[PDB]
Amino acid sequence: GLMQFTLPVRLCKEIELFHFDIGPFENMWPGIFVYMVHRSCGTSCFELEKLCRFIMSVKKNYRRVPYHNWKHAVTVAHCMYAILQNNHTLFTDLERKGLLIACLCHDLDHRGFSNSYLQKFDHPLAALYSTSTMEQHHFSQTVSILQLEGHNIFSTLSSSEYEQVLEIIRKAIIATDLALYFGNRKQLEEMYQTGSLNLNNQSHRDRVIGLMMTACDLCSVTKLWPVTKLTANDIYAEFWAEGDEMKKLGIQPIPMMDRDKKDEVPQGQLGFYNAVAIPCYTTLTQILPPTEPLLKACRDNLSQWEKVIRGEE
């Protein structure tokens, strides 16, 4: 009970900031996650023996891929930790528990390929889950790991509290399907602009949690430029292997996944920032003002990509 996780001073202080990078030491990441749960939720919410065993099983089921890996899981969790901790009063007890766990599990057993490619390949998962294919898989993995003996970190919840948390986790994970982001943000934009936004309406909270999940998932765009730039190399390493795989099916891939169009990445980034990233963080700061520091870092990174196009780096 009285065994609190502590971080070295620099991490203890910087972990609280939105732009914290979790570092290149793999074996410190589970520690960093528990630290965040204990501070965000409390030292009671999970039994440590069960929580440590769940983290290590989750870790085992992320694959050694360039981007969609264990580091991404912990990184996405840290961004949510920072939102929760800057918006203390807005979230329930179940929400703080479920969301750190959703984020850690939100890409479980990712193979480094898009839903689109799974469909063009005719992968069996595309047959089982016709929309949001990889995301329904991520949740299915999350449930299977909770059901391993001694892994049920939610064991002490009541049947209704347990069903509520699993439902928060499912919705949270499905929302990381970027194909669903566009409509969600639009509705939230509309509801914020007409004053209809009501955090006591559950369908409204669901949408706000969705937008949070997108924001945590895209959060490489909110880091220090050198983090943002080097993460982009890993992101493209996956895109370009997917394009290779597309060309093996006799399909010309989109420029994003064509390593031949490597020259045009900078412009492709400006489009992603304007089309996806900046709208996401703008709407999130409208709804939750203390997340403004994500919008500001994202705008700085847009300007860094513009300095790349102009030949200033």
Ligand SMILES: CN(C)C(=O)c1cnn(C)c1C(=O)Nc1ccn2cc(-c3ccccc3)nc2c1
């Ligand atoms: C994980 N994921 C799915 C992401 O989208 C994601 C998450 N974080 N970040 C930073 C991204 C990301 O890079 N998005 C995009 C989206 C469209 N593009 C188009 C091009 C492009 C076009 C022409 C030429 C060369 C490249 N490049 C991109 C990149």
Ligand SMILES: [Cl-]
């Ligand atoms: Cl606190």
Ligand SMILES: [Mg+2]
């Ligand atoms: Mg995903």
Ligand SMILES: [Zn+2]
């Ligand atoms: Zn992700």
